[PDB]
């Protein structure tokens, strides 16, 4: 009974690029897959792994900043919610 969401096109493209196959997800699944996108594309700092640099990537278009820490929860949840609809 978790809320189901339907990502908008750019978010869906990111999710499918890391092997998600569906069109509707829970918020925890969206977060998991975005994390995997960062990990697979090596967008994090090797020393302080919470730090992401996304300026030269579509992820930067999603979050609207060139860099962020994964501790920026308000920004991360807000930008994900701007990029989906509830089902």
Tokens of 83: 């990029």
Contact 70, 52 (CB under 8 A): yes
What minimum distance in Å lies between the beta carbon of 36 and ligand NUT? 6
> Rounded to an integer, what distance in angstroms lies between the CA atom of residue 74 and that of residue 61?
17
> Rounded to an integer, what distance in angstroms lies between the CA atom of residue 18 and that of residue 65?
21
User: 77 vs 85, which CB is nearer to ligand NUT?
Assistant: 77
User: 44 vs 58, which CB is nearer to ligand NUT?
Assistant: 44
- How does DSSP classify residue 17? H
What minimum distance in Å lies between the beta carbon of 41 and ligand NUT? 10
The contact set with ligand NUT (CB under 6 A) reads 31, 34-35, 38-39, 44, 49-50, 52, 70, 73, 76-77
């Amino acid at each position: 009974q978790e809320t189901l969401v339907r990502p908008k096109p750019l978010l869906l493209k990111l999710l499918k690029s890391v092997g998600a196959q569906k069109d509707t997800y829970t918020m925890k699944e969206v977060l998991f897959y975005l994390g995997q996108y960062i990990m697979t594309k090596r967008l994090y700092d090797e020393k302080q792994q919470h730090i992401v640099y996304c300026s030269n990537d579509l992820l930067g278009d999603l979050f609207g900043v060139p860099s962020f820490s994964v501790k920026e929860h308000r920004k991360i949840y807000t930008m994900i919610y701007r990029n989906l609809v509830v089902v």
